[PDB]
Amino acid sequence: VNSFSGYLKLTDNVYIKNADIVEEAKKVKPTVVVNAANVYLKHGGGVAGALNKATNNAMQVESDDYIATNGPLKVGGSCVLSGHNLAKHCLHVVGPNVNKGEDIQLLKSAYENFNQHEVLLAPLLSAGIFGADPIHSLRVCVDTVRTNVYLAVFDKNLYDKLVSSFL
Numbered sequence: 173v174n175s176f177s178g179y180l181k182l183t184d185n186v187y188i189k190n191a192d193i194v195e196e197a198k199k200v201k202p203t204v205v206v207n208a209a210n211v212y213l214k215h216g217g218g219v220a221g222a223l224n225k226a227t228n229n230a231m232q233v234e235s236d237d238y239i240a241t242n243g244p245l246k247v248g249g250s251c252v253l254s255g256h257n258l259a260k261h262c263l264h265v266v267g268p269n270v271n272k273g274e275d276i277q278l279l280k281s282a283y284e285n286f287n288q289h290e291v292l293l294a295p296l297l298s299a300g301i302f303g304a305d306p307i308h309s310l311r312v313c314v315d316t317v318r319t320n321v322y323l324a325v326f327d328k329n330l331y332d333k334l335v336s337s338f339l
Protein backbone atom coordinates (compact mmCIF):
# COMPACT_ATOMS: atom_id res chain seq x y z
CA VAL A 173 0.00 0.00 0.00
CA ASN A 174 1.17 3.63 -0.70
CA SER A 175 -0.09 7.24 -0.06
CA PHE A 176 -1.31 8.05 -3.63
CA SER A 177 -5.10 8.83 -3.65
CA GLY A 178 -7.90 8.96 -6.22
CA TYR A 179 -5.44 7.75 -8.83
CA LEU A 180 -7.33 6.07 -11.77
CA LYS A 181 -6.00 2.57 -12.60
CA LEU A 182 -4.86 2.30 -16.26
CA THR A 183 -2.57 -0.94 -16.17
CA ASP A 184 -0.84 -3.39 -13.53
CA ASN A 185 1.74 -0.62 -12.83
CA VAL A 186 0.49 2.71 -14.31
CA TYR A 187 -1.99 5.03 -12.61
CA ILE A 188 -3.28 8.49 -13.74
CA LYS A 189 -4.96 11.50 -12.12
CA ASN A 190 -6.01 15.07 -13.09
CA ALA A 191 -3.67 16.96 -10.89
CA ASP A 192 -1.03 19.62 -11.22
CA ILE A 193 2.22 17.63 -10.50
CA VAL A 194 3.52 20.52 -8.25
CA GLU A 195 0.44 20.32 -5.89
CA GLU A 196 0.45 16.44 -5.53
CA ALA A 197 4.14 16.36 -4.52
CA LYS A 198 3.50 18.78 -1.63
CA LYS A 199 0.65 16.53 -0.32
CA VAL A 200 2.26 13.05 -0.84
CA LYS A 201 6.01 13.83 -0.36
CA PRO A 202 6.80 10.86 -2.62
CA THR A 203 10.23 9.17 -2.59
CA VAL A 204 10.69 10.32 -6.26
CA VAL A 205 9.09 13.17 -8.22
CA VAL A 206 10.05 13.31 -11.91
CA ASN A 207 10.92 16.67 -13.48
CA ALA A 208 10.42 17.37 -17.20
CA ALA A 209 13.97 18.64 -17.51
CA ASN A 210 16.11 19.93 -20.37
CA VAL A 211 19.79 19.01 -20.82
CA TYR A 212 20.94 22.29 -19.16
CA LEU A 213 18.61 21.82 -16.14
CA LYS A 214 17.29 25.33 -16.85
CA HIS A 215 13.92 25.16 -15.08
CA GLY A 216 12.52 28.41 -16.62
CA GLY A 217 8.92 27.46 -17.32
CA GLY A 218 6.67 24.42 -17.61
CA VAL A 219 6.78 21.63 -14.99
CA ALA A 220 10.46 22.41 -14.37
CA GLY A 221 9.49 26.01 -13.91
CA ALA A 222 6.57 25.18 -11.62
CA LEU A 223 8.54 22.59 -9.56
CA ASN A 224 11.48 24.97 -9.28
CA LYS A 225 9.22 27.89 -8.19
CA ALA A 226 7.73 25.64 -5.46
CA THR A 227 11.31 25.07 -4.12
CA ASN A 228 11.91 28.86 -3.94
CA ASN A 229 14.61 28.41 -6.67
CA ALA A 230 16.63 25.92 -4.55
CA MET A 231 16.18 23.32 -7.34
CA GLN A 232 17.81 25.76 -9.84
CA VAL A 233 20.71 26.56 -7.47
CA GLU A 234 21.43 22.84 -6.97
CA SER A 235 21.05 22.20 -10.72
CA ASP A 236 23.49 24.95 -11.69
CA ASP A 237 26.14 23.39 -9.41
CA TYR A 238 25.39 19.93 -11.00
CA ILE A 239 25.88 21.30 -14.53
CA ALA A 240 29.03 23.25 -13.58
CA THR A 241 30.56 19.94 -12.34
CA ASN A 242 29.14 17.38 -14.85
CA GLY A 243 28.10 19.25 -17.99
CA PRO A 244 24.75 18.81 -19.70
CA LEU A 245 22.58 15.70 -19.64
CA LYS A 246 21.83 13.69 -22.80
CA VAL A 247 18.40 13.85 -24.46
CA GLY A 248 16.82 10.62 -23.12
CA GLY A 249 18.99 10.77 -19.96
CA SER A 250 18.47 11.70 -16.34
CA CYS A 251 20.07 12.57 -13.03
CA VAL A 252 18.93 12.19 -9.43
CA LEU A 253 19.04 15.35 -7.31
CA SER A 254 17.32 16.51 -4.16
CA GLY A 255 13.53 16.67 -3.99
CA HIS A 256 13.79 19.71 -1.69
CA ASN A 257 10.41 20.39 -0.01
CA LEU A 258 8.51 18.32 -2.62
CA ALA A 259 9.92 14.77 -2.40
CA LYS A 260 12.93 12.84 -1.12
CA HIS A 261 14.52 12.89 -4.59
CA CYS A 262 13.86 14.55 -7.95
CA LEU A 263 14.59 12.47 -11.01
CA HIS A 264 15.32 15.04 -13.74
CA VAL A 265 14.47 13.28 -17.03
CA VAL A 266 15.07 14.79 -20.49
CA GLY A 267 12.44 13.81 -23.00
CA PRO A 268 12.93 14.96 -26.62
CA ASN A 269 11.63 18.46 -27.32
CA VAL A 270 9.73 18.36 -30.65
CA ASN A 271 9.82 22.25 -30.71
CA LYS A 272 13.72 21.84 -30.98
CA GLY A 273 13.60 19.00 -33.63
CA GLU A 274 14.73 16.07 -31.32
CA ASP A 275 14.13 12.38 -32.26
CA ILE A 276 10.77 11.22 -30.74
CA GLN A 277 12.28 7.63 -30.60
CA LEU A 278 14.29 9.06 -27.66
CA LEU A 279 11.04 9.17 -25.64
CA LYS A 280 11.34 5.41 -24.91
CA SER A 281 14.94 5.92 -23.66
CA ALA A 282 13.69 8.78 -21.45
CA TYR A 283 10.99 6.58 -19.83
CA GLU A 284 13.52 3.75 -19.26
CA ASN A 285 15.05 5.93 -16.52
CA PHE A 286 11.87 5.39 -14.47
CA ASN A 287 12.66 1.65 -14.18
CA GLN A 288 15.53 2.47 -11.76
CA HIS A 289 12.93 3.58 -9.14
CA GLU A 290 10.27 1.33 -7.58
CA VAL A 291 7.62 4.11 -7.28
CA LEU A 292 7.45 7.57 -8.92
CA LEU A 293 5.16 10.60 -9.22
CA ALA A 294 5.63 11.88 -12.81
CA PRO A 295 4.29 14.02 -15.64
CA LEU A 296 3.91 12.75 -19.18
CA LEU A 297 7.36 13.13 -20.75
CA SER A 298 7.71 15.34 -23.80
CA ALA A 299 4.11 16.64 -23.33
CA GLY A 300 3.14 20.28 -22.80
CA ILE A 301 5.72 22.76 -24.05
CA PHE A 302 7.99 19.86 -25.24
CA GLY A 303 5.58 19.50 -28.17
CA ALA A 304 4.86 15.74 -28.35
CA ASP A 305 1.39 14.16 -28.56
CA PRO A 306 0.44 13.30 -24.93
CA ILE A 307 -1.56 10.24 -26.13
CA HIS A 308 1.67 8.92 -27.63
CA SER A 309 3.62 9.76 -24.46
CA LEU A 310 1.14 7.75 -22.36
CA ARG A 311 1.40 4.76 -24.73
CA VAL A 312 5.24 4.80 -24.55
CA CYS A 313 5.02 5.12 -20.74
CA VAL A 314 2.74 2.06 -20.45
CA ASP A 315 4.86 0.04 -22.87
CA THR A 316 8.24 1.00 -21.25
CA VAL A 317 7.88 1.58 -17.50
CA ARG A 318 7.62 -1.59 -15.40
CA THR A 319 7.86 0.10 -11.97
CA ASN A 320 4.88 1.78 -10.36
CA VAL A 321 4.21 5.19 -11.88
CA TYR A 322 1.60 7.72 -10.74
CA LEU A 323 1.00 10.18 -13.60
CA ALA A 324 -0.44 13.58 -12.98
CA VAL A 325 -2.09 15.32 -15.98
CA PHE A 326 -2.50 19.12 -15.49
CA ASP A 327 -5.22 19.65 -18.18
CA LYS A 328 -8.68 18.37 -17.06
CA ASN A 329 -9.63 18.29 -20.75
CA LEU A 330 -6.47 16.33 -21.70
CA TYR A 331 -6.87 14.03 -18.58
CA ASP A 332 -10.39 13.15 -19.84
CA LYS A 333 -9.13 12.52 -23.45
CA LEU A 334 -6.18 10.34 -22.27
CA VAL A 335 -8.53 8.09 -20.24
CA SER A 336 -11.27 7.91 -22.92
CA SER A 337 -8.79 7.05 -25.72
CA PHE A 338 -6.63 4.59 -23.69
CA LEU A 339 -6.31 1.14 -25.28
Ligand SMILES: O=c1[nH]cnc2c1oc1ccccc12
Nearest residue numbers: 296299300306325326327330
Ligand atom coordinates in the same frame (compact mmCIF):
# COMPACT_ATOMS: atom_id res chain seq x y z
O1 LIG B 1 0.09 18.10 -17.84
C1 LIG B 1 0.18 18.03 -19.02
N1 LIG B 1 0.81 16.93 -19.63
C2 LIG B 1 0.93 16.82 -21.03
N2 LIG B 1 0.36 17.84 -21.90
C3 LIG B 1 -0.33 18.98 -21.27
C4 LIG B 1 -0.45 19.07 -19.89
O2 LIG B 1 -1.12 20.20 -19.58
C5 LIG B 1 -1.47 20.84 -20.71
C6 LIG B 1 -2.19 22.05 -20.85
C7 LIG B 1 -2.44 22.52 -22.12
C8 LIG B 1 -2.01 21.81 -23.24
C9 LIG B 1 -1.30 20.63 -23.09
C10 LIG B 1 -1.03 20.15 -21.82
